[PDB]
């Protein structure tokens with residue numbers, strides 16, 4: 530930490546504060562994450578795992594600094610998060626080819642994490658990072674299980690209904706909501722509490738039953754008393770997404786995590802037949 534000059538705070542989350550910083554020796558510009566708390570021996574090994582987990586679409590973890598009984602993670606710096614890019618692109622929308630590129634690339638990262646049994650668990654526009662060359666990368670995970678107002682908007686229903694051992698399918702759910710948001714320019718499920726989140730999901734997708742989701746009615750926080758809403762058609766939920774986009778989105782948004790599409794199969798969905806890598810117009 531002596532080795533870095535902080536340039537500016539660029540974020541804050543569950544696990545710490547993030548600064549853009551410069552290596553005082555070598556002039557490298559990095560993102561420096563100070564982990565909020567001795568460090569436990571099992572976060573140390575979980576972090577060692579992450580350092581090896583490298584992929585073009587995963588933010589690179591450069592160095593792990595466990596000194597004076599604090600933890601710092603030194604990451605490559607990316608110049609913009611997708612939340613800011615979405616906000617900046619609100620008048621016209623992000624062009625479809627660019628949405629499709631990003632969704633393709635994020636599935637590719639997720640496919641890689643998931644083959645390694647690593648889950649993100651908290652995907653959101655603020656955790657997705659872009660560059661001037663047209664890449665997008667997932668950031669700020671492995672953190673979730675390594676260590677043990679929060680946004681709920683991208684939370685899978687199994688998590689809101691009290692499932693303790695959830696699967697990679699929670700990340701596909703999240704990425705689904707995000708896809709929809711890029712296309713409509715509105716948040717799909719903008720909840721402000723756990724039950725508001727769950728009921729906004731229930732009014733759009735319909736209240737889940739044993740028919741759409743076997744097991745649902747015995748989950749910890751399921752209540753027979755939940756209201757009964759009817760599902761809406763995706764034609765109403767995500768115009769102007771074409772039928773291929775909607776076909777894919779419905780598969781990412783299946784109630785039953787085991788029916789929900791995997792990242793690897795999503796990469797083969799007909800939606801990505803004509804995928805290309807456009808260059809975004811970034812104002813930095």
Ligand SMILES: C[C@@H](O)[C@@H](C)Oc1nc(Nc2ccc([S@](=N)(=O)C3CC3)cc2)ncc1C(F)(F)F
Nearest residue numbers: 540547560604606607608609610613656668669
């Ligand atoms: C994942 C999450 O924590 C962001 C803050 O983290 C990271 N962020 C970046 N770059 C970054 C750059 C610009 C912006 S900005 N808000 O669009 C603009 C100043 C307003 C945001 C983030 N680079 C690496 C990381 C990471 F640490 F994850 F490696």
